[PDB]
């Protein structure tokens, strides 16, 4: 299917997929809502939300629903730690 530098480096394969891309997920690594099973945002999906919402501040669900933490009555906000792990590049050169 889709093979080459231009486009997805993989073909339409896999049971689970992203919610924003709706194509495929490299691996579980993708950011999955701790409350919403359907919500499936990969690395190149959460970041955009981390900056839009608050790169240095809090970052709610990349969907814009502010889904609360499973069991807990508080929204999950990426921590400085992950914020960088997913970003993989703070500089926008
Ligand atoms: Zn995605
Ligand atoms: Zn969510």
CATH number at residue 79: 1.10.10.1580
Q: Which domain holds residue 73?
A: 30-88
Instruction: Report how far ligand 2's centroid is from the alpha carbon of 27 (Å).
Output: 18
List, in sequence order, every beta strand (DSSP E) within 1-93: 31-32, 40-41
Q: CA 10 to CA 18: how far, in whole Å? A: 14
Instruction: Report how far ligand 2's centroid is from the alpha carbon of 8 (Å).
Output: 25
What does 52-70 look like in DSSP terms, one character per residue?
HHHSSS----TTSS-PBPS
Instruction: Report how far ligand 1's centroid is from the alpha carbon of 73 (Å).
Output: 26
Q: Which ligand approaches the C-alpha of residue 86 most closely?
A: 1
């Amino acid at each position: 299917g889709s093979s080459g530098s231009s486009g997805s480096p993989m073909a339409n394969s896999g049971p689970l997929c992203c919610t924003i891309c709706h194509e495929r997920l490299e691996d579980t690594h993708f950011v999955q809502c701790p409350s919403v099973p359907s919500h499936k945002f990969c690395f190149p999906c959460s970041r955009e939300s981390i900056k839009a919402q608050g790169a240095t501040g809090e970052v709610y669900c990349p969907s814009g629903e502010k889904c609360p933490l499973v069991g807990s009555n508080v929204p999950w906000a990426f921590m400085q730690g992950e914020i960088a792990t997913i970003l993989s590049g703070p500089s926008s050169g």
